[PDB]
Design a protein around this ligand. Structure first.
Ligand code: ADP
Ligand code: NA
Ligand code: NA
Ligand code: NA
Lengths: 301, 291
């Protein structure tokens, strides 16, 4: 009657090497807690066989494509295996920055002003009236695809059309007001919000590249005043529930010059390396790594 | 030589019986179009083995849980088989009536006034204060679980609210209370980028009218609106958008279905037929949109 637990790790995404390390750390925390867990490198073993192999429960320590995007969660729902983190809808929805924003926006949650663009709209429109479309956003701006890659900063209009030809490779592209920073991240564990962490990237984007730079620095405590922390904590929780997330995740948020926070995204299978954000926040919150993973596992049912 | 096509059908959802008819029909339409197609009852055959059995492409003719909700789509994405209809996100999002609405409201698309209630608000709030939360919506009201008849009611008087709320909350932790609309209902089939002719649905024994009776201007408006609604949720391949009118003729989006009925007497076949297509052409077009 004790559960056999698959720790899914590695995979075939560009984040494979981080995921190897996450799943390795998860596996050893689970074993420390006395969980009957086993490493499963999904690159070499088909996720569709987990049930055949005797597993009762899955801890997902994969990242990126096929790990945090709904596809693996559908496999697990098909097999009727319980698993960690968010379900099919939320896992997928969180990869789509346009629909994430629209949900948050319809709930009145704060996001930076923006304009989205289809293809049959990119094509239609004159470069010149593309800048009228965005003028109301002021300057500077960020231009990015809706699903990093093709991401770009813009300082005045002449520069815009270039960034827009990059981007459409991707029927949806986003054009938003540039925010000053700093950037913060808020880990969530079940219903509990963990201490926020301020992120300084080695200069401009905290993109995929700055998640293999040994430069990026995290601060926890973040340095926010007590009141700013409570507002950020309540906001992150709202943003997470807004998208139907469960188990655990990480909400990323950006301050602007006005001092207010703006929601960027929710990550539904965060890094779990000893150097990673959720473990960092969890330690500051008073949990050991091992307790953290035992608790994530308990939040799967 | 030719690609082999699995028509997934039947399954174990409540809709199994309808799906067997959908699939029987899809299979005959695909063979008639020249496609090398095979019926596959997913009750007996695990979808996870479609590739090892030699299938190249999948026509999805399953309905309900496990067919149109993203889980099947996830398996197929993992196997990297091309398949008909919407991807994971869209298939799953369209089962969440709350978030579907939120996405449509943020784009300025028309939906009926409503309020959302979570289980915490319930439990915390008294019957009288619940009545007050929904007073602005008037009467009558439709009460339903946010997730996809099960647990749905019509509330005609404030004193019936609590009970409707009780039932709904036994199916979900998210519940919607919506303003009743006086109708009629329409359904708009989408095929790739083409909007097919709308159908009018007259509740009672239900009557289906195609053409719908709308004027050319109204039909054109509805076609544009349906196509916006469908793109708003990231649908592709094909689908059906359900719309309703108020007494003034304004249109309101209800939902999008990402694996419609394909029986000889289903709505999408009826609209295709009015558009000039045989059922065989319809299904071949749908498959061709899968790559
Ligand atoms: N509107 C914005 N203003 C300023 N910086 C932004 C904005 N949007 C994104 N960024 C920066 O770009 C980074 C990555 O973008 P994000 O939308 O969070 O998704 P992705 O995971 O695709 O990189 C953030 O970590 C942040 O540094
Ligand atoms: Na995700
Ligand atoms: Na669906
Ligand atoms: Na009017």
């Amino acid at each position: 009657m004790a559960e056999k637990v698959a720790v899914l790790l590695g995979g075939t995404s560009a984040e494979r090497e981080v995921s190897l390390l996450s799943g390795q750390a998860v596996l050893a925390g689970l074993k420390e807690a006395g969980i009957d867990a086993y490493g499963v490198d999904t690159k070499d073993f088909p996720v569709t066989q987990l049930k055949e192999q005797g597993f009762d429960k899955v801890f997902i320590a994969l990242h990126g494509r096929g790990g945090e995007d709904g596809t693996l969660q559908g496999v697990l729902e098909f097999l009727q295996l319980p698993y960690t983190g968010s379900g099919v809808m939320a896992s997928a929805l969180t990869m789509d920055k346009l629909r994430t924003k629209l949900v948050w926006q319809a709930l009145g949650l704060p996001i930076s002003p923006y304009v989205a663009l289809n293809r049959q709209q990119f094509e239609t429109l004159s470069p010149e009236e593309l800048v009228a479309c965005v003028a109301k956003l002021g300057l500077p701006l960020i231009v990015k695809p809706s699903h990093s890659v093709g991401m770009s900063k813009v300082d005045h209009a002449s520069e815009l059309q270039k960034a827009l030809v990059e981007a459409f490779q991707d029927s949806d592209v986003l054009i938003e007001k540039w925010l000053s920073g700093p950037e913060f991240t808020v880990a969530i564990l079940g219903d509990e919000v963990l201490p926020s962490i301020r992120i300084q990237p080695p200069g401009v984007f905290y993109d995929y590249d700055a998640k293999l730079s040994d430069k990026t620095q995290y601060f926890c405590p973040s340095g926010l005043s007590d009141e700013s922390e409570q507002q950020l904590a309540a906001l992150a929780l709202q943003a997470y529930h807004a998208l139907d997330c469960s188990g655990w995740g990480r909400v990323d948020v950006m301050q602007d010059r006005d001092g207010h926070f703006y929601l960027l995204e929710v990550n539904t299978s965060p890094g779990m390396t000893s150097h990673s954000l959720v473990p960092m926040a969890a330690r500051q919150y008073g949990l050991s790594f091992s307790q953290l993973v035992a608790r994530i596992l308990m939040l799967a049912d």
